[PDB]
């Protein structure tokens, strides 16, 4: 498991049951009612999926797509952003935008 | 600037840092970029003063000294777009991009 960072969600990590990303003035919450909501200014946003499943969770995969699944793995919502295979990250940025970047193209390695 | 990421078009200045857990990436006054506890550095100590780290819109990290000269770059490039260099909690700086999906809370509905 990858350790959690408040403003990030890496490929493989999951949120559920009111787990959320947090940054300056904003929260992106995978709520216990199956709706994914971005709280804070101006308008906010939602996936609009209240009551559509039980025990839903959010997961980012290794093609840059974010999926909401219910407990039986039925798709409730997709970002429809599938792309090249690799490691991705969802950043809830300090300016309020939640953005999926990837794949990873370069990294530091112990020397 | 974000605590633990640098975006395409942003600058980490001299003495600036990204931090996640025990890992601390510093653009030092000696022009060396050092990832504390990550066993990594740009190895650019004394190659300038007033050095700054940037990230290009091709996903390349670049250190420049105080009179605009490029002292180090990451070499890997990909398509044109928006990138983010993120300090991963396992202790690595990773360049991710381009961006592929955006949620925008500033506009309707």
Curated annotation (Swiss-Prot), chain A:
**Binding-site residues, beta-D-mannose:** 31-35, 39, 43-46
- Any S-S bridges, and between which cysteines? 34-56
- Know the name of this protein? Mannose-specific lectin 1 chain 2
Carbohydrate-binding motif 2, short sequence motif: residues: 31-39
> In what residue span(s) does the Bulb-type lectin domain sit?
6-111
Q: Which organism is it from?
A: Colocasia esculenta (Wild taro)
């Amino acid at each position: 498991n990858i350790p959690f960072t408040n403003n990030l969600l890496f490929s493989g990590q999951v949120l559920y049951g009111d787990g959320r990303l947090t940054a300056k003035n904003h929260q992106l919450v995978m709520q216990g009612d199956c709706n994914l909501v971005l709280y804070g200014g101006k308008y906010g946003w939602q996936s609009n999926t209240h009551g559509n499943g039980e025990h839903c969770f959010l997961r980012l995969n290794h093609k840059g797509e974010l999926i909401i699944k219910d407990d039986d793995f039925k798709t409730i919502w997709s970002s429809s952003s599938s792309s090249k295979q690799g490691d991705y990250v969802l950043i809830l940025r300090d300016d309020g935008f939640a953005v999926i970047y990837g794949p990873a193209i370069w990294e530091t390695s112990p020397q | 600037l974000g605590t633990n990421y640098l975006l395409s078009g942003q600058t980490l200045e001299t003495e600036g840092h990204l931090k996640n857990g025990d890992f601390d990436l510093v653009m030092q006054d000696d022009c060396n970029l050092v990832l504390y506890n990550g066993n990594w550095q740009s190895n650019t100590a004394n190659k300038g003063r007033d050095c700054k780290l940037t990230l290009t819109d091709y996903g390349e990290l670049v250190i420049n000294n105080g009179d605009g000269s490029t002292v180090w770059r990451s070499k890997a490039q990909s398509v044109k777009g928006d990138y983010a260099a993120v300090d991963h909690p396992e202790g690595r700086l990773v360049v991710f991009g381009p961006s592929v999906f955006k949620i925008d809370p500033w506009v309707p509905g």
